[PDB]
Amino acid sequence: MTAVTLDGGWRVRLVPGQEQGKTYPKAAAWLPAQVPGAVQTDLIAAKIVPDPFYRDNEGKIQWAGLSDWQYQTRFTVDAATLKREHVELVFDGLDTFAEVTLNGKQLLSADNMFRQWRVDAKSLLKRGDNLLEVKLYSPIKKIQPWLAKQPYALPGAYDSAFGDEPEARHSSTYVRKAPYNFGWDWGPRMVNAGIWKDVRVEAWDAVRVDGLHIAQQRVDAHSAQVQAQLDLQAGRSGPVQVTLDVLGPDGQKVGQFTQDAVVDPGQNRVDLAVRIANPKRWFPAGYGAQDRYTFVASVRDADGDSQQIKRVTGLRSVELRREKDRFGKSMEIVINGIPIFAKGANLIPLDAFPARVTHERMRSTLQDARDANMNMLRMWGGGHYQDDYFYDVADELGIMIWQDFMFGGAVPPYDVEFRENTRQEAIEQVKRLRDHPSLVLWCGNNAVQTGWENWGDRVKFKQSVDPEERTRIERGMTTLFGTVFREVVATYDSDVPYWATSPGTDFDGAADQTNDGDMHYWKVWGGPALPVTEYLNVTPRFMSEYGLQSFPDMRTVRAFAEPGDMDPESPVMRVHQKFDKGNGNKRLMLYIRREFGEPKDFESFVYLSQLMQAEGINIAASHLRASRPQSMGSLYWQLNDVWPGASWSSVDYYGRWKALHYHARRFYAPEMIAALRNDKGQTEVSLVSDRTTPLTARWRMRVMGMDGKVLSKREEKASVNALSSQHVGNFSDKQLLGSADPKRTYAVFELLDGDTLLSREVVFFAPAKQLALPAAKIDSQWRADGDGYALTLTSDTLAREVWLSFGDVDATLSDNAFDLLPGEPLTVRVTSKAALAQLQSALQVRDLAATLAGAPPEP
Amino acid sequence: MTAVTLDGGWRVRLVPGQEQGKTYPKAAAWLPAQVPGAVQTDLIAAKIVPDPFYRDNEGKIQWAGLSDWQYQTRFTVDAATLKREHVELVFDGLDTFAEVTLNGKQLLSADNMFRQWRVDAKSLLKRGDNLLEVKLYSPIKKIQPWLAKQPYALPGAYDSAFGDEPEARHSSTYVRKAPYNFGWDWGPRMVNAGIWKDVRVEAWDAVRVDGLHIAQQRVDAHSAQVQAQLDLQAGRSGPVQVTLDVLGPDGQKVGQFTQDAVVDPGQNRVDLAVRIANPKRWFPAGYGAQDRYTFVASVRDADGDSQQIKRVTGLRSVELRREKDRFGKSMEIVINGIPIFAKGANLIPLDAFPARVTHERMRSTLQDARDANMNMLRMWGGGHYQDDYFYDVADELGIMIWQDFMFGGAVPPYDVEFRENTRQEAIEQVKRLRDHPSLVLWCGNNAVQTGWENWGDRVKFKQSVDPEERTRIERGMTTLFGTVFREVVATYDSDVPYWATSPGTDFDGAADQTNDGDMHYWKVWGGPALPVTEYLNVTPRFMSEYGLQSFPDMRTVRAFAEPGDMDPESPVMRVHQKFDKGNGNKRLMLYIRREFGEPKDFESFVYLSQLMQAEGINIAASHLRASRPQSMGSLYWQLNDVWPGASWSSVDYYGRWKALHYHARRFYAPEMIAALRNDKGQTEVSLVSDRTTPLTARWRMRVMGMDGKVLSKREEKASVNALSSQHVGNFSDKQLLGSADPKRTYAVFELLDGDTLLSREVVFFAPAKQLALPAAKIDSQWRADGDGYALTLTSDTLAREVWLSFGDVDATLSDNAFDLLPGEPLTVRVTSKAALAQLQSALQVRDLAATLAGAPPEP
Ligand SMILES: OC[C@H]1O[C@@H](O)[C@@H](O)[C@@H](O)[C@@H]1O
Ligand SMILES: OC[C@H]1O[C@@H](O)[C@@H](O)[C@@H](O)[C@@H]1O
Ligand SMILES: OC[C@H]1O[C@@H](O)[C@@H](O)[C@@H](O)[C@@H]1O
Ligand SMILES: OC[C@H]1O[C@@H](O)[C@@H](O)[C@@H](O)[C@@H]1O
Ligand SMILES: OC[C@H]1O[C@@H](O)[C@@H](O)[C@@H](O)[C@@H]1O
C-alpha cells in the first residue's frame, strides 16, 4: 500500500477563449499554482492582482470567480507501482465544477467542494511521464444562463455587490460549495476555484483499508462497550487477520484483541467487540479530563502483507434531553449524564481562502475559545467542514462541536440529483469526523426553516408560486434536512443526536420558539434594532445565535487601511463594513451613540464599538446563564473572522482579542455572579455555578459614590447547588441608591469562595454618556516576570473599561478591558518578545471617562 | 426462564353504567370470553347477537363497537416463579384503548392495537390467586367528543353506514387500529374490541433474551456474510457465553460459533460474524428453491442458566432497482441479482375477526397464491400485520411479501405523541418480521399521498385550511412516512428497501405516475368506469393496484342468503355489496351488461360477474407482462375476502376459487402467449418468458369459424430471450378476418416448446353478447384416480368458459373456467369426500353460449 501526493509541479491558466484573457494576458499564460490552494491566491502570489484584503482591492479579483481555469501537472509512475493490482487517483477536494483528464483521456467529473473523488487510473497511466489536467468552471458562469430561464429562482443568500449576478437570483443555492465564498455580511466575495485539498496516487494489491470506526455502544462510569469497525475493500477473496491494540489515556496497554476473517471482492467489515471496565471518560472543558484511548488495528491480508490504522477516541455518552416542564420543553446537551449549559459561540471559516490556513491558526482559534471558558463552538453551516487537525485540537482542549452540515440558509432545490450529491457528501464527512469525541451534535443547516417562515423574501416567494409547487419545495427541504442527513448520522455515528435545523424544533413544529428547541435572536442589532436591555426579556430554551458588531483591533485596522482612510465613512472603511449592503455603519453608530454618544476620534470610535459589543453581550450571556434551567445554551454570533474588517467576532482575523473576549472569560466563568439591571430600575442578582459539587460561597454588595465614598456595604453566606443558578437579589434603584444621584453612583457585586474572589460585576444606573465618571490617574508599574513581564495598574479613582495597547508593538495580555476600583491594584501578565524598555515607552492606557471627555454632541 | 400463558378462564361484560347495559342485560352480566378473541365473537357464541355475516344481521352488532368492555380473569402464581428477580406481564395485543388493573391496582395504559406491552408486575403479584382486569374503551365513543371540538377533522376512510359517526369526521384516523375494522367497500363494520393476542406471565433472573437477528450484510453466489445479532437484557453485570450452531437446508451442520462477553445492567448486544461459502440462497417461487438455514443461539448466563433462541432464515439479496431508461425511471424488485417481474395480488385480512383465523386458512391463502403462479403478495396497509405462522408459510412457499405499515389512506395527525406511538409500533413489527426471507419490501402506507393529491375531498380539505396549517399537516406526513418508518427499516432490517407510499415515487415527486414508481389504476371500475380495453392504454413502471368486482361462489352465496334473497337488488344482497355506499350493483351491472348483456337468472348473474372480472383482469395482467421492461409489476386488487360478499377477490371467504383465480394461473404462467385486441381492431401478439435461459419456441395462430371450419392456420419460430417479452405479431381485424363475420369467427393462439404446449389464448372480435356462439354438447366421463377422480370433458363445438360445479356438495377442481375446442378432450382432477355416485348426480356443466341463450334485453 503506497500513497504518493501530487503536491509539486502544478501550474494554472485561464481556459483559452475568454474575455478575461485579453484583460489579463499574464493569466492567459501559465503561472505557478499551489496545491492545495486557490487560483485567487495563485494570482495574488503572481502579482496579477493585488491583495484583495488591503483597502478597497476586493473588487479587483472578482473576475477570477467568473472565469474558467485550467490546472496542469506532470508526474511519473514507477514500474513497481504499475505492477500493483490497483492504482487509483484520489482527489480530496475540488472546488467545485471540475473536469479532470489523464493523458488526454476522460478521468473524472466532480461537482461537490466537500466530496472525495476516487477513480481507477491504472489503464490510463503510462510508464513514467503522465499529464494530469483539471479544468475548473465558474459556478456563476455555469449556472446563471440556466437560471435566467427558470420560472423562478430560489431564495438564496446575499446579492453581489459587484452586480455580476442578478438581484435575488443567486447561483450559490444550486451548487454544493461553501456558502460564504459568495460573500456574507462580515466577509468579502471570494468565489474560489481551486484544487483546495490534496491529490494522491494510491496503489495496493489484495486489500485496501478504507477506515476504522470505534462505535460506542454504551458508555457510563461502570463500563464502556464499543465495537472496533474495520472497513476493507478487497480485490479478491482471501483470509485476513486483524489485531487490535488498545492503549489507555496514560499510554499503558488496556488489551489486545484478534479476529480472523475471509474477505470477498468489494466491501467488507470486520468487527471487534471491546469492553473497557471503569473507563476514563472524555469530558468537555470545565467538567473533567479530556481522556482519550488509542485503538491500533493491524491487518494482515492474504498475501501476508500488514497494514496499520489508528484512531484516537474519547469515551463519552451524548444525550439531547428534551423533557416537558414549566417553561415548555427543554433543550439540553447531556455529556456523561451531566447536563451541560452550553457556553460558547458560533465558529465560521478562519479565512476567505481556506486552503492557506495553518495548523497554528486552527489551534489558537480553539485555544481562544478554551481561554474564555467556552465548552462549545457551533460550526456554522455557511462555511466548510474543518480540517482533521482542527477536530483533533477540539478533542484535546475539550471544546464540544455543534457541527452544521454546510447549508447556510438558502432554500435548496428538490431534484433527486442534488439530494443524492448532498447525501454522498454527508456520508463522507460523517465518516471522516465521527471518531472525534468533541463532535457531539449534527445539525442539518443554518436557519433554513426560520427563514422560510419569517423572512419577508421567503414568505412572499412561497406564496407567489402555485400551492402544489410550494408543497414540492417544502417536501424537498423536509426530506433533505429531516430524512437524508438524519439517516446518515443514525447509520454512521449513531451515538450522537441529530438536529434538523438551527434554530428549530427538529421539524416537530415551527422554528425559532422560546419554549421548545433553540433560537436565533436578532431583534437586537437586526430588525427593529431594540436596545440591549431587551436581552433581559428573551429567554429561549437554548440560544444558538445572538450578537453585536464591532471593529477589530487598531493593529488590524492599520493592516488593511492607510492613515487617510481612518474614518468610518471613508470608502475603504465602508468596504470593510459588510452589514446591510455597505450601510452597516449606520446601525453600528446607532448602538454606540445610545450608550456613549458621539465618539471624539477614530481610535475612540473603535474602542467604543468594542465596549458597546462587550457590554451588550455580557447582559444576554449572564442572563441566559442565570435563567437556568429555563435556558441551557448560549452561543453568541460570532467567535472569529475570515478577513480584516467589521464583524460580530470577539477575536479578529489576526487572532487579536476584542474587549468582548476578555469579557467572555468573565461572564462564562464556572462560578459567576450576575447583577443585571432592567429598564424598569430593577437589578436582579444571581449566583451561577457549573460545579458538580455544592458551592459554599459568600457574596458581597457595595454601593459606591464616584467621589469614593461608601454608601452601603453588605455580605451574605450562600450555599449554591451544583449545576444551578440561585437568585439572591432583586433591588429597585431606590433600594440601592435611596435618593442618591444615579449619575454619580455605582454598585459592586462580588462572589467569594472562602477568601478567594471568583467573580465581580460593576453596575451603573444610567448610560455611560450621562454619568459623571471621575478623572482617573492610573499608575503603572513594571517588573521582570519570567520570560514575560508583570504590569501592575493602580487607579486613584474608579477607572472604567481600561484598555491596554502598545501601538504597533505586538504583545499579549492576561487581562484587558477591566474596571479599576479606587486604590485597588491589578496586576496583568505581559507576554511579548520585545524588551522591557520599548514596552514601557509604547504602553497606551485608555479608559472610558477619559474617552468620553471632550466628546462632541450627537447629530 | 418461565412463560405461562393466560389462555383459560376469561370472562367479559359491559362496563357498568352504560345504556347498552339496559338494552342488552345479558351483556351487562358476565359472559364467557375467549382470549385471543373479540367481545363481538364472544357475544355471538353467547347467543346475545346473531351471526353478523348472515343475511342482513350486520347492523345488530354495531352497539358493541360503541360500548366499553371489562375483561376479567383469575390466575395463580407459585412461590417458585415469585423467586425470580423479574416477573412481568406481557400483552401481545390489546385492541385498543386499554386500562389494565392487577389486584385492584393500576398496572398499564395501552393505546395501540399493534404494540406489545410489557410491565413489571412482581411487586403487585400475590401469594396464590391473582385478579387481572382489562377494560377496553370504544375508540368511536372516546374520540368523537374530542374530535367534535376540533377546528377540523382530517380526511379519513369510510363513513358509517349506521350514522353513529358524523360524515367526514372519522375517529379511525386518530387511533392506531386496523383501518378495515371501521368498514370498507368489501367488508362489514366490525369495530372490534378485544384481547386479540396472547397474554403471558414471564419471569427471569440474570439475563433475558430480547431477540435474535440474522443480519445479512452481503449475499451472492460466492458467499454470504452475516452477523448473528443477539439482544440481551441484563439485571446485573456479569459474564456470558454464547454458542451459535448453523444448520443447512438439509439439516446438516454448517458450523458452530462461540463468543464470550460481559453484560452490564440494561441492554447488551452480542454479535457473531458468520460467513457461508457458496450459500444455498432463498429464491422466490418459480426462480429456484426456497432454501433456508437454521440459526440456533444458546446463552449461558453468570448463574449458569442456559437459554435458547432460534431463527430460520433464507439468504437473499434484495434490490429495489430504479434506473433511468426510455420509459422514464424503472421500478423493479431484484432478488439474487435477478430482476423479478412481480406477479400477484393484494392481500387483505382473512376475516372481519382476525383472532379466530386458523393456521389452515393462513396456509391455504398463500397456497392459493402459489398455485396461481404468483410470486408476490402485498399485505395492504388497511388491515393488520399477520400472524408469525403466515410469514413462515410465505418463506416456505417462496411468496414474496410487500409489507405495508398499517396506514390505509387516512391523513394522519402531526402531533409528536401520535408519531412516537407509531414509531414504537413500527420498531416492534420490523423486529418481529425481519428474519423472514419472504419480506422483501417495506411500505409506509396505502394511497395517502395520491389521495392527498388526487382525491376530491383531500384537495378541498387542504385548500380550505390555512396554508401554514397545510404545511404543518404535510410536514407531519412526510416525517412519518418519509423519515420515521424509513429509519426504523434502515436500522433494524437494513438489507431490504423502503417505500414511502403505494402508489408513489418515494417522495421524489408526485404519486401515481406512469414513468416513475408504482401505480394504482382505477379509471377502470372506479371513477369514469372506462371499458376494460382501456387497460391496454395504461402502462406504468409497476402496477400495484387494479381490479374488477364479482360475486363469490354460489355455495358462499347460499351460506349468507336465503332463496328469497336471491336477487342483486334484494336488501340482503345490497348489504353484501359494499361498493359505493351500497349502490355498487349498478357499477357491477354496467360492466356485466357491456360484455354479456342482461343475466337471465341469479346463478347466471353470479357466473357472468366472475367471467367479466376474470376476462378483464386477464387483459390487463397480460398487457403488463407483455410490456416488459416498461412495466415490471402486476398486483391486482384483490386476492382474498374478510367476509362472504361481493368484492374484487379471486378467492372468496371460504377459500373457494372464482373464475379469475383459475384464469390467473394462466396469465401468470412462467411462459405465456399474449394476444390482445385493442379498441381499434389491432391484435398484438407477444411471447412472455420468465425463464433465466433462452426459450427457443414455436407459436401458432388459427382463425376459426363458429361452425368448426378452419379459415387460416399459421406457425412461426421465435427465440425468446431470458426474462423478456417479445412481440411477434400485430394483426388488424382485416388481416385476420377478411370479410368474415366477426360475430361468427374467433382466433386461437398457442405457444409451444418442442411438442409441449405451454400457453393458449382464445381471441374474439366482438363482445360475447353479440356473438353467434355454437350450441355446445359436452360429454363427461369419470374414472377413479387414487382417492380422487379424473373427469374428462369433450365438446363437439367450441365451448366458452366452461364452469364445473356440484351444487352444495363440496369438491375441488384442478382446473375450471376453461375453453373447450371442438373434439379436443380436457381432463381435470376431482378431489372430494363424496362418493362418485353423488358427484355424478350433482355435477353441473355451464358454458357461456348456454348461459347467454334465452337472455332478456337490457333495461
Ligand atoms: O446548468 C447547471 C444546472 O443544470 C441543471 O440540469 C440543474 O438540474 C442543475 O444540475 C444545475 O444547477
Ligand atoms: O442574519 C443574522 C446573522 O445570522 C447568522 O447566521 C449569519 O448569517 C450572520 O452573518 C448574520 O448577520
Ligand atoms: O382522548 C382521545 C384522543 O384525545 C386527544 O388527546 C388526541 O390527541 C388523542 O391522543 C387521544 O386518543
Ligand atoms: O375519498 C373519500 C372516501 O371515499 C372514496 O373515495 C374511497 O377512496 C375512500 O377510501 C375515501 O376515504
Ligand atoms: O380506492 C380503490 C380501492 O383502493 C384500494 O386501496 C382499497 O382501499 C379498495 O378497497 C378500494 O376499492
| A773 in Cβ contact with A849 (< 8 Å) | yes
CATH among 3.40.50.10950, 2.60.120.260, 1.10.260.40, 3.40.50.970 for A1-205 = 2.60.120.260
Torsion angle, alpha carbons of B611, B612, B617, B622, to 10: 70
Look at residues A438, A163, A170 and name the one whose alpha carbon lies nearest to residue A290.
A438
Q: Can you name the CATH fold of B315-668?
A: TIM Barrel (3.20.20)
What backbone phi and psi angles, to 5 degrees, belong to A812? -115, 145
Q: Which residues of A touch B270 (CB under 8 A)?
A: 273
Look at residue A3 and give its three-state secondary structure: strand
Integer Cα distance of B403 and B440 in angstroms = 8
Grid cell 471496565 in the structure block, residue: A277
**Quick one: B387 exposed, middle or buried, by C-beta within 10 A (0-12, 13-18, 19+)?**
middle
Look at residues A228, A261, A231, A232 and name the one whose alpha carbon lies nearest to residue A245.
A228
**Neighbour order of strands in the sheet with A826-831:** A778-785, A788-795, A826-831, A812-813
Q: Name the residue of chain B whose CA is nearest to A507's CA.
A: B475
Among B138, B146, B152, B417, say which to mutate for ligand 3: greatest number of ligand atoms within 8 Å of CB.
Answer: B146
Integer Cα distance of A442 and A486 in angstroms = 9
Look at residue A80 and give its three-state secondary structure: helix
The DSSP symbol for B480 reads I
The DSSP symbol for B387 reads P
Query: Three-state SS string across A272-326, please?
Result: EEEEEECCCCECCCCCCCECCEEEEEEEECCCCCEEEEEEEECCCCEEEECCEEC
Go through chain A and tell me how many residues it has: 859
Residue A417 makes CB contacts below 8 A (sequence gap 6+) with: none
Residue/partner pairs of B117-123 with CB below 8 Å, 24 or more apart: B117/B90, B117/B91, B118/B88, B118/B89, B118/B90, B118/B91, B118/B202, B119/B88, B119/B89, B119/B90, B120/B86, B120/B87, B120/B88, B121/B87, B121/B88, B121/B89, B121/B201, B122/B82, B122/B84, B122/B86, B122/B87, B122/B88
Atom number of ligand 1 nearest to Cα A417: 10
Integer Cα distance of B685 and B707 in angstroms = 25
Residue A621 makes CB contacts below 8 A (sequence gap 6+) with: A343, A634, A636, A664, A667, A668
Integer Cα distance of A796 and B788 in angstroms = 119
Integer Cα distance of B250 and A448 in angstroms = 58
Look at residues A665, A638, A658 and name the one whose alpha carbon lies nearest to residue A649.
A638
Cα separation values, A590 from A31, A128, B435, Å: 48, 66, 67
Integer Cα distance of B841 and B832 in angstroms = 14
Look at residues B844, B690, B842 and name the one whose alpha carbon lies nearest to residue B759.
B690
Among B457, B460, B462, B525, say which to mutate for ligand 4: greatest number of ligand atoms within 8 Å of CB.
Answer: B457
| DSSP codes of every residue in A448-510 | HHHHHHH-HHHHHHHHHS-HHHHHHHHHHHHHIIIIIHHHHHHHHSTTS-EESSBSSSTTSS-
| A49 in Cβ contact with A63 (< 8 Å) | no
Kindly report the number of other CB atoms within 10 A of residue B674's CB atom: 25
- Count Cα neighbours of B592 within 13 Å in the Cβ-side half-sphere: 24
Cell of A849: 471617562
Integer Cα distance of A66 and A59 in angstroms = 12
**Neighbour order of strands in the sheet with B338-340:** B318-321, B332-335, B338-340
Domain ranges of chain B: 1-205, 206-314, 315-668, 669-767, 768-859
Element (H, E) at A33: none
Residue A17, beta-bridge partner list: none
Amino acid residing at B137: Y
Look at residues A422, A8, A353, A381 and name the one whose alpha carbon lies nearest to residue A196.
A353
Go through chain B and tell me how many residues it has: 859
Cα separation values, B582 from A56, A535, B161, B185, B572, Å: 80, 65, 9, 9, 11
Any B CB within 8 A of A679 CB: no
Cell of B389: 405462522
Residue A112 makes CB contacts below 8 A (sequence gap 6+) with: A96, A176, A421, A422, A424, A425
Any A CB within 8 A of B267 CB: yes
Any B CB within 8 A of A267 CB: yes
**In whole angstroms, what separates CA B638 from the centre of its chain?**
7
Amino acid residing at A455: W
Flag if A264 and B463 touch (Cβ within 8 Å): no
End-to-end CA distance of chain B: 71
Flag if B482 and A482 touch (Cβ within 8 Å): yes
Residue B601 makes CB contacts below 8 A (sequence gap 6+) with: none
Integer Cα distance of B490 and A434 in angstroms = 19
| A496 in Cβ contact with A314 (< 8 Å) | no
Residue A242, beta-bridge partner list: A259, A299
**In whole angstroms, what separates CA A719 from the centre of its chain?**
36
Angle (deg, nearest 10), helices B485-492 and A485-492: 20
Look at residue B551 and give its three-state secondary structure: coil
What backbone phi and psi angles, to 5 degrees, belong to A720? -95, 120
Grid cell 358493541 in the structure block, residue: B64
Q: In A674-732, which ranges are continuous DSSP H helix?
A: none
| A778 in Cβ contact with A824 (< 8 Å) | no
Q: b/e string for A401-423 if b means 16 or more Cβ within 10 A?
A: bbbbbbbbbbbbbbebebbebbb
Integer Cα distance of B661 and B15 in angstroms = 46
**In whole angstroms, what separates CA A246 from the centre of its chain?**
33
| A712 in Cβ contact with A703 (< 8 Å) | yes
Look at residues B201, B180, B144, B208 and name the one whose alpha carbon lies nearest to residue B4.
B201
Amino acid residing at B537: N
Q: Which residues of B touch A270 (CB under 8 A)?
A: 273
Any B CB within 8 A of A772 CB: no
Check if A521 has its Cβ closer than 6 Å to any atom of ligand 2: no
Check if B419 has its Cβ closer than 6 Å to any atom of ligand 3: no
Flag if B467 and A463 touch (Cβ within 8 Å): yes
Q: Which residues of A touch B217 (CB under 8 A)?
A: 269
| A298 in Cβ contact with A282 (< 8 Å) | no
The DSSP symbol for A767 reads -
The DSSP symbol for B482 reads I
Query: Three-state SS string across B79-128, please?
Result: HHHHHCCEEEEEECCCECEEEEEECCEEEEEEEECCCCEEEECCCCCCCE
Cα radius of gyration (chain B): 29
**Quick one: B112 exposed, middle or buried, by C-beta within 10 A (0-12, 13-18, 19+)?**
buried
Integer Cα distance of B431 and B440 in angstroms = 14
Kindly report the number of other CB atoms within 10 A of residue B78's CB atom: 11
Integer Cα distance of A450 and A447 in angstroms = 5
Check if B143 has its Cβ closer than 6 Å to any atom of ligand 3: yes
Check if B174 has its Cβ closer than 6 Å to any atom of ligand 3: yes
Look at residues A799, A739, A795, A743 and name the one whose alpha carbon lies nearest to residue A769.
A743
- Cβ pairs A/B, distance under 8 A: 83
| A295 in Cβ contact with A245 (< 8 Å) | yes
Cα separation values, B397 from B365, B639, B640, B670, Å: 11, 16, 18, 16
The DSSP symbol for A647 reads B
Any A CB within 8 A of B233 CB: no
Method: X-ray
Atom number of ligand 2 nearest to Cα A185: 10
Give the max Cα distance, chain A: 93
| B549 in Cβ contact with B588 (< 8 Å) | yes
Grid cell 358524523 in the structure block, residue: B166
Element (H, E) at B706: none
| A27 in Cβ contact with A40 (< 8 Å) | no
Cα radius of gyration (chain A): 29
Grid cell 435618593 in the structure block, residue: A739
Tell me the shortest Cα–Cα distance from A569 to chain B, in angstroms: 43
Any B CB within 8 A of A713 CB: no
* Nearest listed ligand to the Cα of residue B155: 4
Integer Cα distance of B505 and B503 in angstroms = 7
Among A185, A407, A520, A578, say which to mutate for ligand 2: greatest number of ligand atoms within 8 Å of CB.
Answer: A185
| DSSP codes of every residue in B236-266 | S-EEEEEEEEEE-TTS-EEEEEEEEEEE-SE
Q: How far is the CA of A417 from the centre of ligand 1 (A)?
A: 9
Integer Cα distance of B204 and B183 in angstroms = 42
Residue B700, beta-bridge partner list: B715, B750
Tell me the shortest Cα–Cα distance from B632 to chain A, in angstroms: 22
The closest CB to that of B273, out of A261, A486, A491, belongs to A261
Residue A243, beta-bridge partner list: A258, A298
Cell of A589: 453608530
Integer Cα distance of B529 and B616 in angstroms = 13
Cell of A552: 477589530
Integer Cα distance of B38 and B410 in angstroms = 24
What backbone phi and psi angles, to 5 degrees, belong to B113? -60, -25
Cα separation values, A496 from A54, A403, B108, B493, Å: 43, 11, 32, 21
Element (H, E) at A47: none
- Is the CA virtual torsion A172, A177, A183, A188 positive or negative? negative
Query: Three-state SS string across A439-457, please?
Result: EEEEECCECHHHHHHHCHH
Closest residue by Cα to atom 11, ligand 4, is: B157
Integer Cα distance of B454 and B472 in angstroms = 19
